Amino acid sequence: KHNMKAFLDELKAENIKKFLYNFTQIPHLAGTEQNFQLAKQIQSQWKEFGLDSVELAHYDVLLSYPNKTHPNYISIINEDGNEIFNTSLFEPPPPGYNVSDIVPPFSAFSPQGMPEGDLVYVNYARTEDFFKLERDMKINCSGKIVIARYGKVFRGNKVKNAQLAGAKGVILYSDPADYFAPGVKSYPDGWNLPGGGVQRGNILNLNGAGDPLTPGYPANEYAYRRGIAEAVGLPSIPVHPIGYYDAQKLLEKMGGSAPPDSSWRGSLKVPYNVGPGFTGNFSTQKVKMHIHSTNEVTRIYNVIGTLRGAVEPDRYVILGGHRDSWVFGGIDPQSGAAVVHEIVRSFGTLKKEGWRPRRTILFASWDAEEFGLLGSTEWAEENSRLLQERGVAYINADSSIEGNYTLRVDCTPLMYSLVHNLTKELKSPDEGFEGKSLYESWTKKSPSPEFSGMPRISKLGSGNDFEVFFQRLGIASGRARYTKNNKFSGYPLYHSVYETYELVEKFYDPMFKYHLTVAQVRGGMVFELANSIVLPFDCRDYAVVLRKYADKIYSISMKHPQEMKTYSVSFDSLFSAVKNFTEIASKFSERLQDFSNPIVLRMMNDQLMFLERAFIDPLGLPDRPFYRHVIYAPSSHNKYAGESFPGIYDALFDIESKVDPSKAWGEVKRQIYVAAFTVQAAAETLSEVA
Amino acid sequence: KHNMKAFLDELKAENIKKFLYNFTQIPHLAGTEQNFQLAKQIQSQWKEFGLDSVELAHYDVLLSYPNKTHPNYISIINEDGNEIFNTSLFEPPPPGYNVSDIVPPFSAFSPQGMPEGDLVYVNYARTEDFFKLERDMKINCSGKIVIARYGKVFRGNKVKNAQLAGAKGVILYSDPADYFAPGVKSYPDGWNLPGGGVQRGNILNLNGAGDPLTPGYPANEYAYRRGIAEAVGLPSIPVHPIGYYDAQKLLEKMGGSAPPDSSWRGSLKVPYNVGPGFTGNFSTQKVKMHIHSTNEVTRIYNVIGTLRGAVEPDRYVILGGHRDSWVFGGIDPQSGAAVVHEIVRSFGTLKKEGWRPRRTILFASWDAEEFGLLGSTEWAEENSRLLQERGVAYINADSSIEGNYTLRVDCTPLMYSLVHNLTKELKSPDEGFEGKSLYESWTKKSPSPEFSGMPRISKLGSGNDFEVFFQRLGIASGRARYTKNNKFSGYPLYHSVYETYELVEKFYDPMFKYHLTVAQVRGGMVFELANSIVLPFDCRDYAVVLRKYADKIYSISMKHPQEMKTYSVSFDSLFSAVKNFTEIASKFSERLQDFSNPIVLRMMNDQLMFLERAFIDPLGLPDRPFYRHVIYAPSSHNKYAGESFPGIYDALFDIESKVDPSKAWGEVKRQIYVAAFTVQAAAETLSEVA
Ligand SMILES: *[C@@H]1O[C@H](CO)[C@@H](O[C@@H]2O[C@H](CO)[C@@H](O[C@@H]3O[C@H](CO)[C@@H](O)[C@H](O[C@H]4O[C@H](CO)[C@@H](O)[C@H](O)[C@@H]4O)[C@@H]3O)[C@H](O)[C@H]2NC(C)=O)[C@H](O)[C@H]1NC(C)=O
Ligand SMILES: *[C@@H]1O[C@H](CO)[C@@H](O[C@@H]2O[C@H](CO)[C@@H](O[C@@H]3O[C@H](CO)[C@@H](O)[C@H](O[C@H]4O[C@H](CO)[C@@H](O)[C@H](O)[C@@H]4O)[C@@H]3O)[C@H](O)[C@H]2NC(C)=O)[C@H](O)[C@H]1NC(C)=O
Ligand SMILES: O=C(N[C@@H](CCCCNC(=O)c1ccc(I)cc1)C(=O)O)N[C@@H](Cc1ccncc1)C(=O)O
Ligand SMILES: O=C(N[C@@H](CCCCNC(=O)c1ccc(I)cc1)C(=O)O)N[C@@H](Cc1ccncc1)C(=O)O
Ligand SMILES: *[C@@H]1O[C@H](CO)[C@@H](O[C@@H]2O[C@H](CO)[C@@H](O)[C@H](O)[C@H]2NC(C)=O)[C@H](O)[C@H]1NC(C)=O
Ligand SMILES: *[C@@H]1O[C@H](CO)[C@@H](O[C@@H]2O[C@H](CO)[C@@H](O)[C@H](O)[C@H]2NC(C)=O)[C@H](O)[C@H]1NC(C)=O
Ligand SMILES: *[C@@H]1O[C@H](CO)[C@@H](O[C@@H]2O[C@H](CO)[C@@H](O)[C@H](O)[C@H]2NC(C)=O)[C@H](O)[C@H]1NC(C)=O
Ligand SMILES: *[C@@H]1O[C@H](CO)[C@@H](O[C@@H]2O[C@H](CO)[C@@H](O)[C@H](O)[C@H]2NC(C)=O)[C@H](O)[C@H]1NC(C)=O
Ligand SMILES: *[C@@H]1O[C@H](CO)[C@@H](O[C@@H]2O[C@H](CO)[C@@H](O)[C@H](O)[C@H]2NC(C)=O)[C@H](O)[C@H]1NC(C)=O
Numbered sequence A, B: 001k002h003n004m005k006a007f008l009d010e011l012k013a014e015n016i017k018k019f020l021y022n023f024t025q026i027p028h029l030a031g032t033e034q035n036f037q038l039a040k041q042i043q044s045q046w047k048e049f050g051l052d053s054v055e056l057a058h059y060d061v062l063l064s065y066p067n068k069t070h071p072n073y074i075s076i077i078n079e080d081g082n083e084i085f086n087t088s089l090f091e092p093p094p095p096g097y098n099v100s101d102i103v104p105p106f107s108a109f110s111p112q113g114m115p116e117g118d119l120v121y122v123n124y125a126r127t128e129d130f131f132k133l134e135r136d137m138k139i140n141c142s143g144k145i146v147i148a149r150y151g152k153v154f155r156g157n158k159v160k161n162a163q164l165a166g167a168k169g170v171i172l173y174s175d176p177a178d179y180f181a182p183g184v185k186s187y188p189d190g191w192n193l194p195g196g197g198v199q200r201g202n203i204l205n206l207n208g209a210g211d212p213l214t215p216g217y218p219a220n221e222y223a224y225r226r227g228i229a230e231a232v233g234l235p236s237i238p239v240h241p242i243g244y245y246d247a248q249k250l251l252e253k254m255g256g257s258a259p260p261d262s263s264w265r266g267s268l269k270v271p272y273n274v275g276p277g278f279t280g281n282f283s284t285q286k287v288k289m290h291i292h293s294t295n296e297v298t299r300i301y302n303v304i305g306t307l308r309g310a311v312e313p314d315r316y317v318i319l320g321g322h323r324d325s326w327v328f329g330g331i332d333p334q335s336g337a338a339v340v341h342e343i344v345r346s347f348g349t350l351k352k353e354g355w356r357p358r359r360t361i362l363f364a365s366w367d368a369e370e371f372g373l374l375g376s377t378e379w380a381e382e383n384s385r386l387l388q389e390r391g392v393a394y395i396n397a398d399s400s401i402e403g404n405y406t407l408r409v410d411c412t413p414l415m416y417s418l419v420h421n422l423t424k425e426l427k428s429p430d431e432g433f434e435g436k437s438l439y440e441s442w443t444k445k446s447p448s449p450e451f452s453g454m455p456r457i458s459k460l461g462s463g464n465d466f467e468v469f470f471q472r473l474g475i476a477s478g479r480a481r482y483t484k485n486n487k488f489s490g491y492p493l494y495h496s497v498y499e500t501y502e503l504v505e506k507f508y509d510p511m512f513k514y515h516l517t518v519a520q521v522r523g524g525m526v527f528e529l530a531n532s533i534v535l536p537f538d539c540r541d542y543a544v545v546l547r548k549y550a551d552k553i554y555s556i557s558m559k560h561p562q563e564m565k566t567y568s569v570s571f572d573s574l575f576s577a578v579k580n581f582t583e584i585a586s587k588f589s590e591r592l593q594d595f596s597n598p599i600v601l602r603m604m605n606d607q608l609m610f611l612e613r614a615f616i617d618p619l620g621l622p623d624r625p626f627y628r629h630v631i632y633a634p635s636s637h638n639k640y641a642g643e644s645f646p647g648i649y650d651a652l653f654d655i656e657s658k659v660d661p662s663k664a665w666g667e668v669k670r671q672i673y674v675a676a677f678t679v680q681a682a683a684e685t686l687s688e689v690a
């Protein structure tokens, strides 16, 4: 028979291994000829595998690259103007890699400049770190160069924070506290970051816009582009990343104030003085950045494969992940792309035997994810009306592994039940759990903070290609990978030259069993979403979390009882809406369990499909028009993390500091009204239709 | 059998007559107890008639009323401060109407004030009239009171124009040139406006927002409201309307410049001097306004009736029209509401015999239409997600008659074929066309400007309750009434106390045959929309008009060939998109004609239903976020008229006057890109789905 077990059994670890090797021999930087050739290869193979149609969708978007003949670096410069120390021009390449087109470490979209000044050390450059510096320690960052350790929050938030503090430049570095696990060797002898390793990465704050020059519309051949002065999300100060050998040289001379406490100290043999500037003898030395990167409109290519549905071809289940990498992409993204490739091969095997899924499955190899989700977002802008009206679900497929300990899942509440049920039917690949389910191992290793006997599933934020589908368009989305036991900092070799096939094969997953388990989870989700007669979404799970999120935001507000009294700030409407949602969802579930009638079925499937869609506000969130989901948005302090009831959360954040409390609390009340209304409107989509 | 002919034959002129009488005995001003009682009556009757559910949907919205104890008036005031002439405090009431709650003439939402100044006469106060005054005649309106004749464009546009010209007040009046047909007697002896008659009406420029205090969200019990200082669309200068007896007294003393030509002269025995101010002997007299109206949040009530569909209950066909009137509403709106009432009665008769429509029909009696579409818009805001995903079509039903000459229709191109086919099956009520079709009489009396043997159908604009459904939500909409042989000025007694049952019964439609024909057109459209197996929309009709509109906007641009050369302004993308739409629509039509499969059918019905939806841009038009349709918007110079490709039209309007032509032509190119993209995206919704 042709059922999920047949699909799952066709998946093979050995194929994933072969694909990963094939995908990681040369760099595949977005916008480069190498990445276009790989796109063409994938297109050809997906056709061979049996998909109905496989096309390239291209766009011309703003990318950023270093200047090959004018390299980026940082100096310590003496009073005479002599540069007495320089940071590296490249990472030492790994053994066996005379590869020529390795992009040197840089911060994509940094402006050009040669700022020269005194250093201030700002820990992780988080909102609370700048509060500590400016409010408690009374240190002024205006006209200073900020040095910050990577970790904890998206680097673009660090840069925005530094900019608003008045910094004239930002130096990002990898501290061994965050990127060197105790007792493991550095690459190539282990999976740790060497002192010469550096984390690449973009520093934009796009808030969901996609290509900086074309917000709202696809960057096609006739697109009108913003002038660079009006581009979305570009930083105004230069930024550059370095490794910890170089950072130690910059930090060791730091003077001024002591770190305020131990949470500001990393593992290097330096004081972690905050500054500003260097200790007495070196007080006249400065730090000088030299950044010469350019922003360039460049063609990118998505591969889009279609497997037409037998019964509901106008309903789309999408499996997507990116293909562009910073260098070799051993983990990010090719460990994910190899899994997608084997999933396509498996579905195609069933297709060649006469099977088709109930609903259409779309498969995507996205481009320019590393530059801000540009490929997925431009394609979703081009196809927004089709996706709006036909999109059932989106499953992401970036890195399959970032460790080998247990499963990690973020998804809409609508998919919790699907994930629980699927993982109870899959074998655990873990040592000590042979013969046990993946649900059993995952629940043991990553227990739910609220329920006994359940695993942890987190809120979707951003940082990957599901963002446009979920936060802009309101299509139910999910993601899953194998992880470690600093969940937002990345694994040690993240975005470094050292992320290679050998890293994965030697140190992460020699038997490709964790990859295979991830293929079964991602592929199994897609199979059920595309094949189940009734869509596998449980609306009651949204009702449960909505109460949790309402309790949480009420509790934040209740830190200010006098203001809530003064401005008559009531959450009664929001709790009422949540109560109604709970009641209506329970009744809908009863009807769904209780109906041969394909119109009632589809009517009910449409109610399930449009339920995520109902949380979209067409006016967007304040000053973030492309984040339209009222329940979830990426955190304003950390793009990687999701925030619940974000419009109310941001209205309450640091509210005690606002100089017009009447206005500030007014806006809290406005956000409570928008949230209560949206929850009740979403509930009403589940009521009997007439 | 239960077919359209059975529905149509059940409609009776005598019932419409009885309902009109019943609806027009007392005033039904929005927000008043009288209008709430009528709502309750309608709700009860719709239940009796056989609808499945009939509910009231209430909202608390900003309304405006005169102060009962501090009346509005205008004076001529001498140098001593003596008010030597005063305008009327009320219209002389018609014969047989000691009715107490007749609202005196006022301009709803006028601010309060007592401005005193010199008069400038500005013709119809259109954009081109102010261009003529300011650019050609060199007359400065700053600090002047403007007097303008009603007619040609929505009064709110006049007021906005006056405000931007620097006027400190606006006096609106009805000239007998526009409101007194030659050879007909004034009310009560004929249908003309007497010298004491006055046209009420709101002067807001809401641009689709609905309630001024709650743009985007329904004005429910917990709604957060804007402060009045941030309310949408309120004028900043006082405004008041008067009749032509009073206007003659204001105009007869006017001096300064002669009218520039005869198109500035009405029919009163005055010079129509433009001013500023009065002729020599009266040069020291001034005009003083006294406006004391108040804006007040007030409860309004929509009646919403449901007739559940037998097969597709989650697809909604909506018949809606308003119930609130300025005074008795003999024509506006009760001639329409009486027709809706008889339509409900007819559908209910079929229901009581065991029939149900295929799709759900919703019937609406809207409140506060006269104050800016407030009832329909708040309800659509509350229900936007249901309407988005389930709304098939909206048919409006305000005034059924504004004359007795021929049919008038405005609708989306998607309904052209439906209207042609329906009117070929209906009997003409016209003298001289007995035994002929309504299509034949209508085509003879109102020929299409482009096609021989076809009738004229116009573009939807605004000024009525379809606006939110069509321009904000992208639901296919239409409207139809009987009309005269100044198509935007209104009939002579429009919004006056003289619009009574007797006006209609004596002078417009004694046999109620034109009302019955309008009931057959509106009801027949609803019947076919709710009952036809395939939705009765022809996408090829949109392809035809899109080419027409593209040719028209190109021709406007081509008035500036040097700039098009300099800034490389090309319409090639827009013509390409239109060509593609034409090709794809033709192929879709072929498939629609060529498929026992209810999924392919519904899939195809969903493609038809979402086609109007595809022209919506979620970012809205520039500075008009609630006008989201890219093909049609209300004209920026006249809310009543529709404009095609409005974003490009407004970018090109008066472009030769912009002081940065590079920027202005850049924005033209941006709008061409948005339009080309939207047309191609709409086309692609008609492609094979996978
Ligand atoms: C959750 O679902 C429930 C339905 O089970 C829904 O209840 C609705 O609550 C509203 C808001 O409170 C009720 O609104 C009332 O409606 C009546 C007429 O039906 C009015 O007379 C009321 O107004 C008077 O009282 C007000 C409050 O004191 C005064 O401010 C006002 O000026 C009037 O004097 C009031 O508008 C509505 O009737 C119910 N509907 C029901 C029970 O069917 C509730 O709103 C849902 N929650 C959310 C957040 O939507
Ligand atoms: C109407 O529908 C037609 C399809 O029938 C659709 O045609 C598409 O036109 C685009 C835009 O011109 C084509 O885009 C080209 O794609 C090829 C690869 O397929 C590229 O190599 C081309 O780029 C080169 O040439 C450009 C122009 O000189 C250069 O600026 C560029 O830098 C490159 O050198 C170009 O992007 C596309 O292939 C077709 N698709 C087809 C024929 O299937 C048309 O776009 C539709 N109209 C609208 C308004 O959407
Ligand atoms: O590297 C990226 N994403 C990586 C980020 C890895 C560090 C933070 N991890 C998480 O947010 C995370 C959360 C849940 C799960 I299951 C897996 C990973 C990824 O999702 O695997 N994206 C790029 C590009 C980017 C895209 C959008 N917005 C910001 C940056 C980047 O962060 O530089
Ligand atoms: O009176 C209103 N509408 C009337 C306007 C009558 C004069 C202009 N006529 C048209 O625009 C028109 C166009 C096509 C057809 I078929 C029938 C009438 C109506 O549509 O019958 N609406 C109110 C309230 C209003 C609503 C929205 N925007 C502005 C005003 C007003 O104009 O004062
Ligand atoms: C990755 O695998 C692909 C597919 O097997 C390889 O591309 C093929 O290479 C052979 C030999 O050059 C050609 O005959 C085919 O035309 C290619 N097929 C394609 C592109 O679909 C490719 O060589 C492998 N790459 C690496 C680095 O191992
Ligand atoms: C750091 O790099 C800079 C730039 O290459 C070096 O400074 C240059 O040295 C050469 C010859 O020694 C001079 O001709 C250039 O004018 C210098 N350029 C600048 C901008 O100063 C510098 O020597 C390097 N420092 C160290 C310690 O290696
Ligand atoms: C996950 O599995 C559970 C247990 O099988 C499913 O819940 C059952 O669903 C069937 C079909 O409606 C009902 O008859 C049972 O009463 C349910 N058991 C319960 C709720 O304990 C559940 O639907 C599955 N989730 C999916 C498919 O998303
Ligand atoms: C309009 O018609 C309605 C319905 O026939 C009339 O309201 C009814 O009046 C009678 C006599 O007062 C009552 O017994 C009913 O309770 C009413 N029915 C309703 C409100 O549904 C009303 O009198 C008529 N109005 C006018 C002005 O003629
Ligand atoms: C126009 O109306 C005004 C206001 O009622 C009249 O002026 C008032 O006249 C009374 C007594 O005659 C005075 O006590 C008030 O002080 C006046 N008020 C103002 C504001 O001037 C005026 O007489 C009327 N003019 C005409 C020609 O009828």
Ligand SMILES: *[C@@H]1O[C@H](CO)[C@@H](O[C@@H]2O[C@H](CO)[C@@H](O)[C@H](O)[C@H]2NC(C)=O)[C@H](O)[C@H]1NC(C)=O
Pocket: B417, B418, B421, B536, B537, B538, B593
């Ligand atoms: C209006 O009526 C025309 C003429 O009957 C309909 O066009 C016909 O539709 C049938 C059914 O698809 C076709 O077999 C004929 O070839 C059509 N005749 C033509 C195009 O001349 C048309 O569909 C009707 N419009 C509606 C229902 O919206």
Ligand SMILES: *[C@@H]1O[C@H](CO)[C@@H](O)[C@H](O)[C@H]1NC(C)=O
Pocket: A067, A068, A069, A070, A294
């Ligand atoms: C890169 O730097 C070189 C060498 O100085 C220079 O000639 C060229 O303009 C730069 N390339 C850019 C800015 O794209």
Ligand SMILES: *[C@@H]1O[C@H](CO)[C@@H](O)[C@H](O)[C@H]1NC(C)=O
Pocket: A140, A141, A142, A143
């Ligand atoms: C920081 O420094 C500059 C002067 O160099 C000053 O303009 C700025 O306002 C200072 N900010 C604070 C908070 O002291």
Ligand SMILES: *[C@@H]1O[C@H](CO)[C@@H](O)[C@H](O)[C@H]1NC(C)=O
Pocket: A191, A403, A404, A484, A507, A508
């Ligand atoms: C894989 O698991 C083993 C056993 O616990 C561990 O020692 C090793 O470090 C893991 N590899 C990674 C990359 O976490």
Ligand SMILES: *[C@@H]1O[C@H](CO)[C@@H](O)[C@H](O)[C@H]1NC(C)=O
Pocket: B067, B068, B069, B070, B294
């Ligand atoms: C109306 O005018 C009266 C009489 O002068 C005044 O007392 C009252 O305040 C006004 N009503 C309003 C402004 O609503």
Ligand SMILES: *[C@@H]1O[C@H](CO)[C@@H](O)[C@H](O)[C@H]1NC(C)=O
Pocket: B140, B141, B142, B143
């Ligand atoms: C009109 O009049 C005022 C002075 O009373 C002046 O400020 C304004 O600029 C004038 N406008 C023009 C166009 O002359």
Ligand SMILES: *[C@@H]1O[C@H](CO)[C@@H](O)[C@H](O)[C@H]1NC(C)=O
Pocket: B191, B403, B404, B484, B507, B508
């Ligand atoms: C009704 O039609 C007749 C005959 O042409 C005409 O004389 C009369 O004025 C019409 N009534 C209206 C209100 O147009």
Ligand SMILES: [Ca+2]
Pocket: A209, A210, A211, A213, A214, A215, A216, A217, A218, A219, A377, A378, A381
């Ligand atoms: Ca874009």
Ligand SMILES: [Ca+2]
Pocket: B209, B210, B211, B213, B214, B215, B216, B217, B218, B219, B377, B378, B381
């Ligand atoms: Ca509102």
Ligand SMILES: [Cl-]
Pocket: A396, A397, A398, A399, A464, A479, A480, A481
């Ligand atoms: Cl992922």
Ligand SMILES: [Cl-]
Pocket: B396, B397, B398, B399, B464, B479, B480, B481
């Ligand atoms: Cl109408």
Ligand SMILES: [Zn+2]
Pocket: A322, A332, A333, A369, A398, A399
């Ligand atoms: Zn990635």
Ligand SMILES: [Zn+2]
Pocket: A332, A370, A495
């Ligand atoms: Zn990455």
Ligand SMILES: [Zn+2]
Pocket: B322, B332, B333, B369, B398, B399
């Ligand atoms: Zn009306």
Ligand SMILES: [Zn+2]
Pocket: B332, B370, B495
């Ligand atoms: Zn009206």
